Amino acid sequence: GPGGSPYLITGIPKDPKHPLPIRKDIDDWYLEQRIQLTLFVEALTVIQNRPLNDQLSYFRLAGIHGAPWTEWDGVPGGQPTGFAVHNNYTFPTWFRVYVTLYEQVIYEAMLDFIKQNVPQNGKADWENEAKQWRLPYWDFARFARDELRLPILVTMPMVKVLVPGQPGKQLSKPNPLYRFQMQTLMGTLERPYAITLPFDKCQSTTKYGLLENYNADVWADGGQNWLRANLALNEHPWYQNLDGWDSVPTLQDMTFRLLTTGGLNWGEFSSTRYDAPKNWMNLEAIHNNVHNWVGGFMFSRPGRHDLKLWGAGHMSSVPVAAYDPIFWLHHCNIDRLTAIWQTVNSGSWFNDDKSKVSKDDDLRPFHRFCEKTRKVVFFRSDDVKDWRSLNYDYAITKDIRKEISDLYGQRTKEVYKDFGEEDYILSIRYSRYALGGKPFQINIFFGDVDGKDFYDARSQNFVGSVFNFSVLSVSQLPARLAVHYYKKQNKGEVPTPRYVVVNSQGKAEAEVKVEVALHKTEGTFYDDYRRVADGKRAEVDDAYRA
Amino acid sequence: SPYLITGIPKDPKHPLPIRKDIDDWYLEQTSAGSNRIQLTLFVEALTVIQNRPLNDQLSYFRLAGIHGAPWTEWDGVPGTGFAVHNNYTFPTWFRVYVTLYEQVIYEAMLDFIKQNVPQNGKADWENEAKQWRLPYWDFARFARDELRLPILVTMPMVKVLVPGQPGKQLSKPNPLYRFQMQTLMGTLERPYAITDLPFDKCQSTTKYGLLENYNADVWADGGQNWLRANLALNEHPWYQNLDGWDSVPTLQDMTFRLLTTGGLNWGEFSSTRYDDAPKNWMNLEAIHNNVHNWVGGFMFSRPGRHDLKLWGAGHMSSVPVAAYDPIFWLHHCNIDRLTAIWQTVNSGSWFNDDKSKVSKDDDLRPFHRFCEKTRKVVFFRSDDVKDWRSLNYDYAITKDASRIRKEISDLYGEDYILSIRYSRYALGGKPFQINIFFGDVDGKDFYDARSQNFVGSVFNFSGAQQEQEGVLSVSQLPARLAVHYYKKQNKGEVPTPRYVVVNSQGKAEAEVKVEVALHKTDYRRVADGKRAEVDDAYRA
Ligand SMILES: [O-][O-]
Ligand SMILES: [Cu+2]
Ligand SMILES: [Cu+2]
C-alpha cells in the first residue's frame, strides 16, 4: 500500500461518539440534503483524480475487481481473472470486504479534505460528519419516490456542494457518481494499466452508450442512458403491458422471494454456483441481472430498427463493471441483502458441505492485522460474518420481517392476491462458460416467440431473463403471473417454457445448453414444488441466428 | 459597438471557403491524420466564447440571447426576440445571424492563436483559421441507412491539439455537446435570467432530458439523449415499421421536395407565413420547425401508464431558448445552405411576389453594417445578403451549379400530399404538434411513428396572445406511400386524414381546429381531415 506497507482494511475507525453509524438509502440520504454530500462529492472526486500509481486511486480500487488485472497492495495480479469472487460461495463476503475498502478510502479522503480546506471554526463539525457518514446503498428493489429506478444522484451530471469558509456559497461541480472519466481512452493508459465490446475505446464509463454503427469517437463517452437503465430495471412479463393487467417489477418479486423464502443453506443463498429448484433464487443471480439492466450488454441487433433499445455499458461486463460509480452502490445493497438474509437465517453460515470448503479461503487481496497471531493476513469470511465488526450497520438490521414486506412485498402481494392460491417458478441452469467465458442472456417466453424480437419486455410473450454475468450456475424466475395469463389464452394449458440464448450481437446462440423447467405448488409463496413442464429452445429468424 | 458584421475577412490564399458538412469535416479532422487544427480552433474558440461574461455582448450567452429570451438589448439596439419567424425574411434574418456567429468564432480563433501558438507556428494556425467556416448539419442526408445528429454533437469530450506541444493531445469538454452555465439559468444576474417547461431550472441545454416526475435537480442537466433525437429525426409513417416494408424518413422526402419542386415564389418557399396553392406549401421554415422539435423534444409528460418513456423536452423545441443549444447554429447553417441551393435553382424568385415584396426592405435588426454610399452604419437588409458569397463563404453544392440537380437527387432523392394550415396562436402562442393518421387512432398513443396509423407531423415552433391579423401558417407532408398502404389494408378506401393536436403534457387539445386536406395528382383535393378523439384521460 501507500508508504510501502500493507493497507490495513478496518472499516471506519470506531469513535465512541459515533456508535455503529448506518449506511443509508442513497435517495433518502440525497433528498434529506449538506456537509455529508459535499464531503462525499469532494473526497470521491479527489480519489477519482488520483494517479494510476496511487493504489488508493479510484482506478486502482476498481481495478482490484477485474481488468486490467494488475497487482494491488503487493498481491500479484495477472490471474484472465481478477481478484473478485464470482460463482462461488464467498461471493457475499469477498464483496463485503471490497465495499468496506471503498468506504474506508472515501472516509480517509474526507479527513484529508477537511484538513486542507475547512477553517478552524468548522473543523470539528466537518469531522463529526465524516465520522457519521457511511457509504450509501442503492435500493434497486424499492420503488423510487410506481417504479424501480437508478439513484437520483446517479442521474445528475452536476451536483451543488458547499464551499468551506464561504457561508451560503455553493458551487456546481461534475458529479463523481454520474460517471468515472479518465484523461484518455482506457485502452491507451500507461502500461500495465490499459484496459484491452469496445471498452478499450472508452474514456468514461457509460450506460447503454456503446452501439455498433456509430463513430468510434462516440464510444469515448457513450453517456448515461439512465432512462433506458430504469426501463430495464422494471423488467416484467410482456403481457403486463396489455390493457386490463397490472404489472409487478420482476426484480422486486425476486428480491422479496430471496429475503422471505426459508430453508436455504448458505451455499444456496450466496451464489449461482451449482455443483430443489425452489432454492435456486440466490443473491448472486439477482445481482447479475441488475448488472445487466444498469449497463446494457447488447452492442448490436440484426436487421433494421428505428427505435434502438440495445446499447452496452460497463456495468454488464465483469472485467470493467467496477469502474462505474454505481457499481459500489449496487454492491453496498448486495451487502445489505446479505445482512438481512443472515439476520433471518441465523444458523445458515457456510453450513452446507459445498460452501464449508470455501469458508476458510483467503479473500485476496485484502489485508488485516491479526491481533491473535500478530501478523498481517488476508481477510477470511468468518472475520466479516458480523458486518458490524467493520463499524457500519443498516437501519433494517437494527431490529425486519415487516420491513421486508413493506419495502419489497406490497406490490407482489397486491397483484398475486387477484389470482388463485398457486405459485409457479422457473428454474434455470446453465454453464457460465458455455460461450467461452462470454456473457449471454437467457430469455424465457410462454407461447410463440417472435423470431425478430426475443429480447425484453416489449418482446411478444416474454416472461423474464437470466443474465450470465461472466461447475454449473443456477437462477430462478417468478412465473406465477405469466402462467396465469398464458393459461387464460390457452384453455388452461400449462405453457412450455421457451428459451432463447442471446449474445451481445442480439443473435440467438443455438449451442448454449440451458436447463429450464416450470414448477408449481399449491398455495402462494408468501404464505411442495413439482415440475409441470420442460423447457424447449425457441427458434428465431435465420437473420437473427448466431 | 456597433459590431460590424462582415463575414470572415477575405484573404487571397483562401478563395470563398466553404462551409462543410460537419460530419465530413469532423472525419477529415480526425481521420486524415493527427493534425486536427481547425477542430482544435473551433473547440477552443467556442469554449472561450461560451465562458465570456454576460456583459460581453460577444459571449455565447448574449449571441444566443439575440434570438429569444432573455430579450435584452444587443449592440445598442433595444430588446419577443429579434428573430424573424413566420415571415418572408426568415431565411435572410438567419443568414445574417449565422454569419455573426461564424465571424465571432473566427475572431476568437485569432485570439486563441495570439495567446497559445508559438511565433513559429502562427502562420500555420492562422492559415487554418482563415480556411475554416461554420460547418452545417445535414439533417436530411443519410449519416456516413438513417438521418442523424452530427457525430461531434454526440460526443461529451473532444481531443484537441496543444500548440507548441506536438503529441500533447488533450481531451476537453466539447462545447458543441451542450451549453453549460455555472448556475441555473433562472438565477443569472439581472437582466439576463431566464425567468410549461422548467428551463429556469436548467444549468445546461438538454435534448429530451426534461421529464415530469423526476427530481427537479435532474433538470439542471437533463443530458443529451441523442439516440432519441435521432429516432425522432427519422420519423416516417407507422406502417413502415411492419415486417416487409421499406422505410423512407419523411424529413429527407420533405427536403428533396423543397429543393426540386419548381415554380414556387419567394413568399411560398421562404416561410410558413400564409397571408390571406397547397402544392406549394412545402416550405423551408416548416421543415426547420419540425427539426427543432425532433432534436429537442417538447413533451414534458405523458398521461397514463408507460413502461417505455419516449417523451422528454429540451431547448431546441422551444423558441425562447433554442439558440442556447450549440446544434441550433448548425441547423441554421444548413437552413442557410438550403436557401442558397433553392436560390440557385430559382434565381429569379427573390422577394418577387406581391406577398413577400413589402418585407424585402425590412431592417434586420439588430445586425449592423457599414454603408459605403452614405459612409454610415445601417442595419442589414435582405438584398445585402442575396448573394451569400458577399459574406465570404460558400457551400460545395452551390460552388458548382452545373451538377446541382444531380447532387440534390444523390443526397436526398399518382402523388398524394397533405396540406396543413394552422394558427401559431391556436394555443395562445404555446407550442403544439399536429399529428396526422390514416385509420383508427389509438386513444392512448397518438404521438409518433410508434403510434398506430401515424402518417406525419407538423410542429408549431412558437412560444391574451394572437397572431398578426390575416396571417396563418402552412406546412405540407408527403402522403403517397402512406395512402398506398392504407388503401391496401382498407379495400382501396382513400383515407380521411385524422388529426390530433398534442400539447407539452402529451394531451390532445380537442378545441384546436387545423385545416388538413389530402390532395392527389395538378393536385385535386380528395379528402378533408377531421379531428380524432383520444381517451378521456389523455384529453387536455
Ligand atoms: O460482481 O461485480
Ligand atoms: Cu457485481
Ligand atoms: Cu428561431
Ligand SMILES: [Cu+2]
Ligand atoms: Cu431555428
